[PDB]
Amino acid sequence: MREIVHIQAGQCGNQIGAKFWEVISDEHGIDPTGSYHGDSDLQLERINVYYNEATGNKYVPRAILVDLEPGTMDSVRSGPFGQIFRPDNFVFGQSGAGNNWAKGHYTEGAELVDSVLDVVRKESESCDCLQGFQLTHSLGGGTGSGMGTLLISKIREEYPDRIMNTFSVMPSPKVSDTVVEPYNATLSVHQLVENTDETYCIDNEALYDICFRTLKLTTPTYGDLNHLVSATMSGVTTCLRFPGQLNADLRKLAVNMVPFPRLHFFMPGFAPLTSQYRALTVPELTQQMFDSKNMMAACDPRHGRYLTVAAIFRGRMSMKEVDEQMLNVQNKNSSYFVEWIPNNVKTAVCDIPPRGLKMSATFIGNSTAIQELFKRISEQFTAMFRRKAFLHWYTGEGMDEMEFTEAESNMNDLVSEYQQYQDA
Amino acid sequence: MRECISIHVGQAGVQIGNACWELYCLEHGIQPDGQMPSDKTIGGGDDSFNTFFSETGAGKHVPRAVFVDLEPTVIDEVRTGTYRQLFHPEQLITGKEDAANNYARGHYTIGKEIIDLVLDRIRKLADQCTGLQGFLVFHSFGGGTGSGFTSLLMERLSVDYGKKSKLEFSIYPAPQVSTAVVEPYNSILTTHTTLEHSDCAFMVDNEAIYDICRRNLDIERPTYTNLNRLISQIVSSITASLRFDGALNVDLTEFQTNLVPYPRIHFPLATYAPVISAEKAYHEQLSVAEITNACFEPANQMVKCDPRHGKYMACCLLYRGDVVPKDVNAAIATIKTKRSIQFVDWCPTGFKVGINYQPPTVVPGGDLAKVQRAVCMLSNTTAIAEAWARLDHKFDLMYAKRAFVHWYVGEGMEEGEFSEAREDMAALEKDYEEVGVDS
């Protein structure tokens, strides 16, 4: 059945995870009570990828909700589809993690992880052919970043031949909780380079700009940013939740998207940017989707080259005109694709559009311009660490300056690796 | 009478299998429930169609096929489809998880654990054979199963049946209808491993068929159904000699003998005409001489290449329908002059011809129009080395950076099997040059 186990950790991880289940449950006919009231069986054909069946033939998300304080979880429970979720699958502690990676990864997190892995284990064993795991979390806080990457290390240990995929939100000064965010995020990126197969870099800087100078919102809330994440997460998983010529699964996606095992951080993209009754034409989907202004990761992709790309158009449109329009923008912009990976841009079409759009296009890009992101964090990181500032919050939890130097070092390698393929 | 066992590996091999076995039933008049009214010898026989079908006491005619796929999704559709009552449940073999477009994961990792079961299921067919000839193996070059498990199966088949012929129908990979960026990798890999175990391999380039479906059936986006129903006609022409009364190409050894002098050079170029849209309102039926000239246009080959620029080693013409030899040697006579047809010096410039008077069958409702005469040409020309050159360049671009190699090594392969397989293809490209061009 190739089931996926979804895990959402921390504040940012549980709010975007909560929106994800809202969006795709509507796409699959499942109402807030877990009952299915849809019209096509395309909705139910591949529905066991993300849902377990119930006794009343209801549907329950294969979702585990993890936090080190309950504040967000009871709010998820009180929110829209909150009662869709398996009540045992709420795993949480009380002390919080203080926007502190060490507390999530080493002290408070370690106290809670085994109970999390018991739910993982329970959810995993029911699966006929589990493909792997999908984690939603931010990297700038403490639970989603520190505990999140701890969970990933343990899962890799228990399930080393399953696929680990994450949706990982990147801190940005423009949308910032605390100044130690670059510390937490440098530490998590080291974990993600080693222990995930595919990571989607959702940048909070990009979501803000899109929300400001495009969706024409002058002061965007987190709900505006998370609306954009809902849409990308729905689209990036369309080929997984719906049947097609493509038999897309997590392992095949990694095989075809990742030429080099460390370079597996994807820039997602979306069109049209929702926040409208004239559907976009296929040349609009194509031009917009590839515009700098439609990337969720805040790198101009004209600054580096695409190793690989995977795109889906949702709606009822000219399959051929897609191919025509794709191959156009490629051969109008062939300066930003690598000439040494034949046929590295792949396209799909799906007849089911998402709610409130007749035409949409999601884009997954493995571009070397994502080095702009890691450079950005690496600069913010060194700016503090050179004066050892704010470190006491970490050395008081056990960590040595050593562990920081290595994470700084391993991430600057990541930026070097990405740079050597920009020129080839 | 001597039996032939068909083996369908992967998605491409199974779905084309379905396309062929449906056509075989329409051609020999076998109903979806296995019954064959015209067959009067109930429960046995040594007829020509018995080479492909066995018979049960209750009168059912049962394919001598085995279907294998590392995942269940596609063979499951045979399990419930219009011909569920056709096959023995034991003939449809599916695993748990597929080979994730990875040669090394279909060969080494997942492959090693279904291989003994499949051979045991094939053995139960071999045991139903009074004098088995060998095997017809259908697969993609590009899938992980299709490339990786097949070369594992072709290895053991040489071991369990060293004295049996093995024929290949191979789907070569085309971008404008494709599924993985690493198909060039799996292509080279499986070709290197499978070579010495296959006596004759018919390569179908998916771009050729796709363009043929676009140009001649006027279909904008050809489906796999469109692609496969046309591939069936060509496979039915090639196999017709084994399932029907005839004196040309009557056993698998005759395919080696007639088309394969040099054994490494065993990839005969197929050409086929006419392809005619069934929604073509008014159509002027084409002549023997017309459909034989088509056999020399690139746009009708199963692999786009320019045979004017290599040398032929053999040519076979297989007609289906209203054809007589007078019509044929006339058309040959005229084409010999006006076209560049150059054999190798150590080979006779000539054609072996065969005519089955039954005109081609079409799937009712499908996209191909019924015709009164068709032909399939099988020419062992050296211009098919263009398709190796193409594949080998695409492999060279990626492998110079080692892109995606880690996914193979991750399964137990060594980088060396990559440069060993490419060194083999570089030889095979050179052999073709030693035979096809002059200083």
Next chain:
Amino acid sequence: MYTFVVRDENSSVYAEVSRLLLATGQWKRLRKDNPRFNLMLGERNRLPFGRLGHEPGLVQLVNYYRGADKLCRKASLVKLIKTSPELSCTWFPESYVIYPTDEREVFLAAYNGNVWIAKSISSEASELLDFIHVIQKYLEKPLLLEPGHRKFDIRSWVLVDHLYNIYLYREGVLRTSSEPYNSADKTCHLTNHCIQKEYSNYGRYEEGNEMFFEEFNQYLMDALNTTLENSILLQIKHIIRSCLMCIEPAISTKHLHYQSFQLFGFDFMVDEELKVWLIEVNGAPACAQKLYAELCQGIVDVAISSVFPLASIFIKL
């Protein structure tokens, strides 16, 4: 807007076709090895034809004809006229193919006076056969230009488009040894820029050794009471037609997955009886200096933009 790549960097004329192309604001150049092009300007040697015409949504055009070396390599050019029935033919010198086929045996059946020539000149067989390459009779009685008593050859440029229309460039060039003609001593026997820019006073009786068409017609009028059309160009158009119509079925790209055009350089000799002779065909010719602009533009007009349209100077044959 269209896509082209460049893969013969030191091509005299296609360097300028590639430059005019950029300058129209409608053609983007790529790296050599980028396979997403509309138009190759390929390698002289080993152009990879087997990889053309396999890019979805890409119409591909190349500036060479696979198989055109049948005409240009002087070894196979002789074999072609001897072997091809369309070329019985009495405008090609008597020629034989010989190796360090071959035809040394019947090479002497005609030897009862004989003087010949060979490279890739003598009157006795030994002097040249020690080169152990084709053997032609030497034009002992060529036409002479006065004052000067000069030999010369004629370079006509011929363009064949993707449809196999044969286009003769209106402008041609005479390339004369601007020194008197003798008999034996080997300077004015080979008259071009390969025994004249180093060995041979290099531009005496005219300019650049290059007498262009308008002048030569005028000479023929006053000096012979005839014209360049009647006395010579008819036979040239006959020879151009005959060669290219001969190989057309071997090299045509009419029903092919890519398409070819190619520019050729035919070289002719005229004798004293005003009869025209074919010397050899050049698959990669360079143009005469002052004509580049008009011809390199005419290429892009009828060979390049003909296929890839945007927003005469030839004679059809």
Next chain:
Amino acid sequence: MEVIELNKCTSGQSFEVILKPPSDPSLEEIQKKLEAAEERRKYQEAELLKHLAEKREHEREV
């Protein structure tokens, strides 16, 4: 242009037409490789579980 072995029958005809004339590895060797790959897989996994085990004793030291 000659014609040889003309073969008629009830289903059709077959013949030849000339225009000019002319001038395996063992099971054990398999098992070897197939198991020298599984060992390479198991080695790579043991190195993974060893690096993970070291992470545990770092998590325990912090």
